[PDB]
């Protein structure tokens, strides 16, 4: 049951080889088991299934290659359905041949598409060259280039061949495509005339300088017509082949764009299956595969069913059944989780993983973390806004689960949606009882505050006239006061100038009380944890002296806080004692028989008694456990030094913790005050700009002014002070609560599954 770490079971099994693949796959389809590593020597060439995994590694690279080609081509991958693994029979070889088929067809067909296209482009240039040259020892050359190069090209011809070259240029009837980049550019043809090879070499060197495309040409219209007939044949043939080349590439890409979905599932599962098989052992004589697992005790049957089914999905008859192990090391720790509980387990696991069978913080944390958050985050309106934010994530959940995760903030807040909603709801509850949103009341409650007529009763009537000119304080005297108040916080303290004194007395004393309570729960959990582990020494030398220490110190403080709230009132307020002073003078024995009045009969005796009783607990925690342990180890025929170091550290952390951790809950008051101040300032510095003396002139400004107010209150309060309270409350759990009981040391249980793909 989830109040503690789940009971596991170590098991050993005799996995028949022909069933093995099937069994592993079924177990990963179930996703409720962790295999042990039985091969400490495992490495790239030491692994028993080198080839099988290496084939998967390469098939995955082949998938990635064909997928990249398909995605560059933007051909739609269908991504339909969901699929089983490959058979154990060697059918992966036919799949590997299919990978090679697609790859080889792409490499070939792509190269051909490029080459054919390049030839077609060159022959198009040559067709235009032949058509222009048809207008025409002496010789000539012809070619094409980007037209903007021609002016510099011709000037360079006369610059090198000093004032002497004959030539003609002609712009092409359309731009032509660049064979590498696919850029269409307005090229021009040229033809150049000269005598002898010496000039041929110069005009050629300049053509090379401008990267001009030269071509051979025949000397007459008739010989040019014969060449053009060749070109016209080649270019048509090339385009006919290229059309079918491109069409075939599209079939190849489309076939693969179906297959990637299926192949990804098959390959990734297969890789994982063989990797899990590589954790098994096979000794030199060994026929079956020896394997070992941690399973939930509740699901020992579920894995045995999966083993029997794995054999039944195979030619094997051997059911591969397990034995339960007894000579066990401490198993990995597992907890089942769901939407309302997973984030709460995660924030617990994030400090540390509970010991096997250990009490689990997470179910208590499902309430107490939201509670501590809301006690700190005590605004009614922010409670609403937090609630609305998390509601919009929960309502859109089925949509959002399909979307991107690469926005990590969005991923985190969505992964927190349930925890965030709960704390938001509790923050309405706390914010309501504090009677505050943005330092504004809710008018739902009545009041204990007194109207001006109640001050006009002859007595104090002058103060109602002084009020026209000066500040005044109501001392809450009988007859004048509006009587004891039945709701949460009285609305009046929102508007009152002295309000912080009243509000602080509450939030301080409250936070102290809650802290004591939560620490008393944590030591109470320690007892139940020590009971489940059956440890008399930990109860007798730990829990008993510890709870007596804590309780004797803490009980008086809470008791006296309640006593002040009952025994003192307005007509006794002057010369009433300080609560904090009596607590300090208890802990230090230091009351000087004078100053502040004692509260009740025999209180000095109680102060002395409770402290002495707590002091008497210390030697049991500090030393008597180490001593009885030393005698037990000497009789049972470990280090006494390390035993003293550990037990002293724990005892010191508890004893000093009863100062520091007791004070630590003041964090609640602290941040609560900060939140309240921030909210009041953020209202006061902003909203009042829209509070003009006329309807229209104020209301138009108030729209934009309120949007700035919303932006700032979100960024500061709803985001950051929220994140503050969140992280503080986690700390309060991780130490001041948990350190009484939760060891938080163990392996995380890791179920093997396809879900990790």
């Amino acid at each position: 049951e989830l109040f503690r770490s789940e009971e596991m079971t170590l098991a050993q099994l005799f996995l028949q080889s022909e069933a093995a693949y099937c069994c592993v796959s079924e177990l990963e389809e179930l996703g409720k088991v962790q295999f042990r590593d039985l091969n400490p020597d495992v490495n790239v060439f030491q692994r028993k299934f080198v080839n099988e995994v290496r084939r998967c590694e390469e098939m995955d690279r082949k998938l990635r290659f064909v997928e990249k080609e398909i995605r560059k081509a933007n051909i739609p991958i269908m991504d339909t359905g969901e699929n089983p693994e490959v058979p154990f029979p060697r059918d992966m070889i036919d799949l590997e041949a299919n990978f090679e088929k697609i790859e080889n067809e792409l490499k070939e067909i792509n190269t051909n598409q490029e080459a054919l296209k390049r030839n077609f482009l060159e022959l198009t240039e040559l067709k235009f060259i032949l058509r222009k040259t048809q207008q025409f020892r002496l010789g000539f050359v012809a070619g094409v280039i980007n037209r903007e190069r021609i002016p510099t090209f011709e000037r360079m011809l006369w610059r090198v061949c000093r004032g002497n070259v004959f030539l003609r240029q002609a712009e092409i009837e359309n731009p032509l495509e660049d064979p590498v980049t696919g850029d269409y550019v307005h090229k021009s043809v040229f033809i150049i005339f000269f005598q002898g090879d010496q000039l041929k070499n110069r005009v050629k060197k300049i053509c090379e300088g401008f990267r001009a495309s030269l071509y051979p040409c025949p000397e007459t219209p008739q010989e040019r017509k014969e060449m053009a007939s060749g070109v016209n044949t080649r270019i048509d043939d090339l385009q006919m082949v290229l059309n079918q080349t491109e069409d075939h590439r599209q079939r190849v890409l489309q076939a693969a764009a179906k297959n990637i979905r299926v192949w990804f599932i098959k390959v990734r599962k297969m890789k994982a299956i063989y990797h899990t098989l590589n954790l098994c052992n096979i000794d030199v004589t060994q026929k079956c595969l020896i394997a070992e697992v941690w399973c939930p005790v509740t699901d020992l049957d579920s894995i045995q069913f999966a083993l029997r089914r794995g054999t039944e999905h195979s030619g094997s008859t051997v059911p591969s059944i397990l034995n339960r192990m007894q000579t066990n090391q401490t198993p990995p720790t597992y907890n089942k989780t769901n939407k309302f509980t997973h984030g709460f387990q995660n924030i617990v696991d994030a400090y540390g993983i509970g010991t096997y069978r250990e009490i689990n913080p997470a179910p208590y944390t499902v309430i107490t973390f939201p509670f501590l958050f809301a006690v700190m985050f005590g605004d009614f309106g922010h409670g609403i806004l937090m609630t609305l934010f998390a509601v919009w994530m929960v309502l859109r959940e089925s949509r959002i689960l399909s979307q991107k995760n690469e926005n990590e903030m969005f991923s985190m807040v969505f992964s927190g949606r349930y925890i965030i909603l709960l704390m938001g709801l509790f923050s309405i509850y706390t914010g309501l009882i504090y009677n505050d949103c943005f330092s504004k009341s809710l008018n739902i409650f009545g009041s204990s505050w007194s109207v001006r007529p109640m001050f006009t009763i002859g007595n104090w009537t002058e103060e109602t006239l002084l009020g026209s000119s000066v500040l005044q304080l109501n001392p809450a005297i009988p007859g004048v006061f509006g009587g004891p108040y039945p709701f949460g916080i009285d609305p009046i303290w929102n508007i009152a100038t002295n309000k912080l004194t009243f509000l602080n007395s509450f939030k301080m004393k409250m936070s102290v009380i809650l802290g004591i309570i939560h620490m008393l729960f944590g030591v109470s959990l320690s007892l139940f944890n020590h009971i489940y582990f059956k440890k008399p020494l930990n109860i007798y030398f730990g829990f008993i002296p510890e709870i007596i220490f804590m309780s004797s110190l803490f009980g008086y403080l809470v008791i006296l806080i309640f006593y002040k709230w009952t025994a003192y009132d307005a007509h006794s307020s002057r010369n009433a004692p300080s609560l904090l002073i009596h607590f300090i003078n208890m802990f230090l024995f230091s009351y000087p028989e004078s100053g502040n009045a004692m509260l009740y009969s025999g209180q000095k005796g109680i102060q002395c008694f409770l402290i002495v009783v707590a002091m008497l607990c210390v030697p049991w925690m500090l030393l008597f456990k180490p001593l009885i342990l030393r005698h037990q180890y000497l009789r049972k025929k470990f280090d006494f030094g390390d035993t003293m170091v550990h037990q002293a550290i724990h005892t010191i952390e508890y004893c000093l913790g009863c100062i520091s951790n007791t004070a630590s809950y003041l964090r609640l008051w602290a941040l609560s005050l900060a939140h309240a101040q921030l909210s009041e300032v953020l209202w006061t510095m902003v909203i009042h700009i829209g509070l003009h003396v006329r309807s229209l002139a104020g209301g138009l400004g108030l729209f934009f002014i309120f949007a700035a107010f919303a932006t700032l209150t979100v960024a500061i309060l709803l985001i950051m002070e929220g994140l503050s309270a969140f992280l503080h409350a986690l700390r309060l759990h991780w130490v001041e609560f948990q350190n009484k009981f939760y060891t938080g040391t163990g392996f995380k249980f890791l179920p093997f599954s396809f879900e990790h793909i």
């Binding site: 050993q12 005799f14 000794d283 004589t285 060994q286 026929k287 079956c288 020896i290 034995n323 192990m325």
Partner: protein
């Protein structure tokens, strides 16, 4: 774990038995020269009788 230990013992006995069978059969292959002679003597005696009949 007794189950794997008993299996390992049977696998060891299986590996021993096949290895002893290989050694036994390799010794039988060397016996061919001993078993051959009685057939060789019968062929000699048959050809002797054939030659005496031809004489």
């Amino acid at each position: 774990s007794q189950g794997i230990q008993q299996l390992l013992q049977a696998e060891k006995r299986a590996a021993e038995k096949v290895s002893e069978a290989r050694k036994r059969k390799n010794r039988r292959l060397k016996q061919a020269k001993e078993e051959a002679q009685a057939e060789i003597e019968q062929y000699r005696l048959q050809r002797e009788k054939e030659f005496k009949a031809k004489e």
